[PDB]
Symmetry: D2
Subunit: 331 residues, 4 copies
């Protein structure tokens, strides 16, 4: 008999479906950062990786596998075929094209639509009941695309949105006040990136409003220019790109955070992108960031933040701009 | 009159030194993977990063900083100057020259030795009481080099040695037996990499020796060819490099495991490179991997493994060739 | 409208079931030790508690609930009705009578049996696919009683057994060697308690056999008295009861460790009680401790430990004794 | 030679003074609940336990030690003599005299003062640079007592204060709103227990003030009775005592959260008791709960909360109530 048969007596052979499975699509810097963070937080009992670059994908899979002794995820798989993704609770999409210098924005978005036209149908076929978490840029447009192609109810399509913007905002705030970001509460909402909206009325430590103490907070004519905090969120994103060429660790950690709430049904509030139609004067099928409650259902609830006229106006403009692009897309 | 003073009443401005600082030298894929693993394992109250490439260095620092909301390390610093590394409890060196001959007449070993020549004095200056953890290759030679330059006692200079080798070996054992690598015990010792030695007599599940069950284990007449498991360890190392260009996650994870033992004073046993002068008929000043007890003093103790004649000859062989290189090193 | 409706817009109201539910039956010192350990290891998305004493049960439930801010388990329920345990994955039974003054061992066993005649049918009623983890003493006998009444396949009926014995043993061995228990490997098998069996041949550090380099290990002729280590394990069990009146923290950690493997499908090897028929010449329906591979299906596999004649004899005697009591049980 | 010496070669025997040591004084339900929460969160490399009841103290030490296999805190000591507390970074005081029938208010505090007259000078004798975290009731007076006897700067004397109060409050809020307590923000300040003050203005989810949405928040006439949430805090405390006789888990978890911020220098904000003279028109040496930034030097900063005149008045009354006792204390 084999060494295995000499050592180990088998009681059963039967193999269940993985109960807590997560899939990462796209093994670039972002996907891999999401991957390691998820593994280190013991969020999955099985992890699947998918990309089109075959060699890189096997390389990444093996690197992770070799670390198994220090992890609590017993099975890591990868492949070009989506059968390896079957029965996923959570599916994270990080796949995207790289914008070229002679390339339009509409052309870039369409290129990622063409990418999602391949990925999404395959994910739905093998994990019909899964939650979708979209990271690919422009996140808000691609969250819409994913929602449209999948045919999933809105609660199952989650966009990364302003989770990272908020994360960075709270870091900067915390460094300014000499207090840990966990205790610095701040919400950046609306469209992810350059057009995001900081809600100055909500910024507080220990529940005392900074806007109440400082009525000119976040305003153009503010002596201290706390507007700088949001300004520097935007600038630092470009700075990181200029310095190392990509961003990984921070986005990886923020995504792991969302995954944690979903996989463990925590029902914590998170600034994520969702179907925004019906509020702040928006009539179009568009996804934007508002604090949402996250659990095993994805987005079960959303918080109705009280926005000023100028803030509401900014979300309108973003939704108009987003729907203006979306109506010119080929499926 | 300022918002911060309005919000927060200061009791004291007192400068203090961090109580559990860790530094990572070399901000490449290995350095960065060690850093993120360490950060997610909550091992340090401060992380410092050092490299010669300045823009990449600042990029990585900021990316890490931006995830502060999801971590318990309140302070991450970086710089070209070693003042940022002061008062470290543990210093991890993952620095190394570009693997490109023709850039200098000095070979890879010689190039990395020169890199160590101005690194080690700089870290011992700011952290005279730290433990040194050497990862850079050739790890065994460089551990000796770091020991020779630093002037540190033996217990405070640790090489990564065969930690990765064993981690990869246990993963593969676990796969053959359908058991988690944590329950699959097995030790690869000697010189890190190609010339490493698997100790067949130690391999066991639940204290049941595999060699006792199966005497042909690791020989040429094994019908299940278990010798192939160590061969695959070597092969997979080259295959990762072939596929993705570098290794990161596995080595990063194993380094964090050592750091855990050290920072928490656990006294766990790890395959790491230490001076083996006085063991296995070795009389020269060489560092090879043996099972070491790891704690707040570094390597406080080492396990004396009984080896077969063949295994002893392979370590001696390694020791001779290592000493042959080192006796011709000028400082 | 309510403030809740003011604050929160609801997307859907789909009520949901726990995906990782754990139930603890018996809310005493052991029961709570398990609960708190489990809660702090983030193993469950819901914890259920049941006991016959209603006032203590509610008060314990509340106390845990009040720690929710610092926990990751969103739901903690309790009740005397077993409808609170519906769809549990793991069911831990810590319930039992205590030996009265006039009471003899036989009378006490049957009284626990009577308790299981109530609990066991009620458990399977609501969670027919759960794993049964038996903690209550006499654990080996009562594991069998769980097995008989449930009608469960042996793989889903698990006795805590020698897990605490091994835990305590490895602690003492560690204290002797100045090594963390994690790196000190030793297995205590067979009947839990006074009649447990230390497997000297499997005791090792870093894969090096203690028996091999110290052949008198295990015998009276030993000058270093290592039999005392196993004897001290027995002594400590009585001593703790004399000193504080009960055991809680050590058993609660051991159980939670078993819980982690089961819930996360780790396939780690643990010393637990399982149907031993057909091993070591034992013909009776008897549960004894051997190393088992624990996963999502409970005990999938057993490690076949090569015992000596002496050890085999001790196990077979335990089996005869256990059946002598089991044969006379009315249930 | 000993088996130990045959197996292990020693590099050095000399041992370092404790680096991350925590002591817990009082080994009742509260002290042990803190002990286990600290251990399971890995906040110390050494834990000391102190009490006057020598038999149960030993029993608890042993029980914790038998769990070392599943813990990452390698050194656990206990003893009646305070030499076992030497070089503690943090000392947690949970020792208290039980409440008697028909017993005077000034009487119970004095009995506890005399307990502190022995404890406090002993702790400073062996850990003169530690931080004191006081848990014993009445927590606000005894924090002051500890401050006066220690001679420590106020920043190093911390009362658990309203930490448990706020934790329970946020659980009840969370239960009402269908959202995890971590996302439900609310502060109860002032005097711990019966006379605590709920700060209705700082109550929010995602920066959205509940007071602003619902101006009746906190008033007797509120149709939704949101004030009952605070009343339910007080009532649950008496209920738990009634149902089980004591309260352990919740207090343990909260205390350990405070320990985390101190040990890892997090600079998070917690509602704890500090010397409040100079604030809110208070003119006496009184300790009251207020948001404080907690780090390696204890309280370095506090948040200046804007209070309504009703809240301010209640705080001033507590101060006067507390000072009346303190000024009539013999120590
Ligand atoms: N949402 C955010 O806050 C945020 C932050 C940072 C980055 N991002 C976005 O995340 C994406 C990841 O960027 P990187 O990972 O930095 O970029 P990258 O170009 O390194 O990664 C893209 C990966 O997608 C893969 N891919 C392409 N087409 C695919 C397909 N049809 N199926 C599967 N995989 C496919 C590619 O092989 C590549 O590995 C980018 O679009 C970036 O804009 C979003
Ligand atoms: N110990 C192991 O088992 C193991 C495993 C894998 C890799 N390694 C070794 O780790 C090393 C690093 O791996 P990598 O993939 O990050 O390599 P890399 O070339 O990507 O990283 C090397 C880094 O060192 C920096 N550096 C160069 N000179 C420096 C100096 N004088 N001071 C400070 N930093 C300096 C470089 O700027 C670069 O960022 C390699 O030598 C590799 O062989 C060891
Ligand atoms: N196997 C081991 O390693 C190990 C270690 C320690 C303790 N134990 C065993 O664990 C058991 C419990 O110990 P403990 O100190 O928690 O005991 P305990 O006196 O607290 O009793 C446990 C609880 O069982 C409850 N109970 C009784 N009948 C019940 C019923 N019909 N349904 C539900 N609950 C019921 C009681 O109310 C009590 O709260 C003991 O039998 C002890 O021998 C085993
Ligand atoms: N601040 C809070 O939120 C909060 C919450 C709950 C309980 N508590 C307080 O915690 C305290 C302890 O509660 P418990 O349930 O553990 O009570 P307990 O009476 O069971 O424990 C008190 C322990 O203190 C020990 N002790 C007494 N005098 C001592 C001395 N001179 N030196 C050392 N140890 C000594 C006793 O031996 C006893 O074990 C109580 O005063 C309670 O009011 C505070
Ligand atoms: O950190 C970020 N980086 C991105 C980015 C990521 C990867 C790549 N490449 C290009 C080369 O290939 C590698 C990936 C290029 C850009 C960014 C930065 C400035 S504009 C967009 C994407 C993104 O959305 C954020 S967050 C952000 C961005 C702008 C403003 C505010 C925020 Cl919070
Ligand atoms: O995983 C490994 N990879 C290394 C390696 C790491 C980085 C780079 N580059 C090249 C491109 O630039 C980035 C760094 C090149 C090689 C290796 C693999 C085969 S030979 C050496 C270094 C190393 O030591 C191990 S472990 C190992 C190696 C050989 C045999 C056995 C083992 Cl366990
Ligand atoms: O730690 C233990 N304690 C027990 C035990 C636990 C609780 C109670 N009560 C009685 C008072 O009410 C509270 C519960 C009574 C006994 C023990 C101790 C000496 S004999 C059995 C049960 C048990 O099985 C172990 S482990 C053990 C026992 C013997 C030998 C070896 C080992 Cl590892
Ligand atoms: O949870 C608590 N429990 C205590 C308490 C703790 C232990 C004991 N014993 C005495 C009998 O021996 C066993 C321990 C007695 C009382 C309490 C409960 C009602 S009044 C005070 C102490 C305390 O301060 C709080 S918190 C609290 C209290 C009142 C209002 C609001 C809050 Cl948050």
């Amino acid at each position: 008999a084999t060494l295995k048969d000499q050592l180990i007596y088998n009681l059963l052979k039967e193999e269940q479906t993985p109960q807590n499975k997560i899939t990462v699509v796209g093994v670039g810097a972002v996907g891999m950062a999401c991957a390691i963070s998820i593994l280190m937080k013991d969020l999955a009992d099985e992890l699947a990786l998918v990309d089109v670059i075959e060699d890189k994908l096997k390389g990444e899979m093996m690197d992770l596998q070799h670390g198994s002794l220090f992890l609590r995820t017993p099975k890591i798989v990868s492949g070009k075929d989506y059968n390896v993704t079957a029965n996923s609770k959570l599916v994270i999409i990080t796949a995207g094209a790289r914008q070229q210098e002679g390339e339009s924005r509409l052309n870039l978005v369409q290129r990622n639509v063409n990418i999602f036209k391949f990925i999404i149908p395959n994910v739905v076929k093998y994990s019909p009941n899964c939650k979708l978490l979209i990271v690919s840029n422009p996140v808000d447009i691609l969250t819409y695309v994913a929602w449209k192609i999948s045919g999933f109810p809105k609660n199952r399509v989650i966009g990364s949105g302003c989770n990272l913007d908020s994360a960075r905002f709270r870091y900067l705030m915390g460094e300014r006040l000499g207090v840990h970001p966990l205790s610095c509460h701040g919400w950046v909402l609306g469209e992810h990136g350059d057009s995001s909206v900081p809600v100055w009325s909500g910024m507080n430590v220990a529940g005392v409003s900074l806007k109440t103490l400082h009525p000119d907070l976040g305003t153009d004519k503010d002596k201290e220019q706390w507007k700088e905090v949001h300004k520097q969120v935007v600038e630092s994103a470009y700075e990181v790109i200029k310095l190392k060429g990509y961003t990984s660790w921070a986005i990886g950690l923020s995504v792991a955070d969302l995954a944690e709430s979903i996989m463990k049904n925590l029902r914590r509030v998170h600034p994520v992108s969702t179907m925004i139609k019906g509020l702040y004067g928006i009539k179009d099928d568009v996804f934007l960031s508002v604090p949402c409650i996250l659990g095993q259902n994805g987005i079960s609830d959303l918080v109705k933040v009280t926005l000023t006229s100028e803030e509401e106006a900014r979300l309108k403009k973003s939704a108009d701009t987003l729907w203006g692009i979306q109506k010119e897309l080929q499926f």
